[PDB]
Amino acid sequence: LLHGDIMPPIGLTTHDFYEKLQLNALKFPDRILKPIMNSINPETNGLFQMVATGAKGSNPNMIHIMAGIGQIEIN
């Protein structure tokens, strides 16, 4: 953006294209689970057992609790 290299496609302004690029860049990768499961004993971890068996919680809940919340998206 600073060097004037961001060229929006036909249909988006530079602001909208930049926001879309930033939103895509700040999504957590799939390998964020690797540090979480390296620290978790799945046969013993109560939180992981509740999340994985479907009793309560999901993967995003565990990621937010342990690794990071990430980008706050509103609308």
Least separation, in Å, of the C-beta of 22 and other proteins?
11
Give residues in contact with other proteins (CB under 8 A): 1-2, 4-11, 13-16, 18, 75
Least separation, in Å, of the C-beta of 13 and other proteins?
5
Least separation, in Å, of the C-beta of 65 and other proteins?
24
Buried b (16+ CB within 10 A) or exposed e, 23-38: eeeeeeeeebbeebee
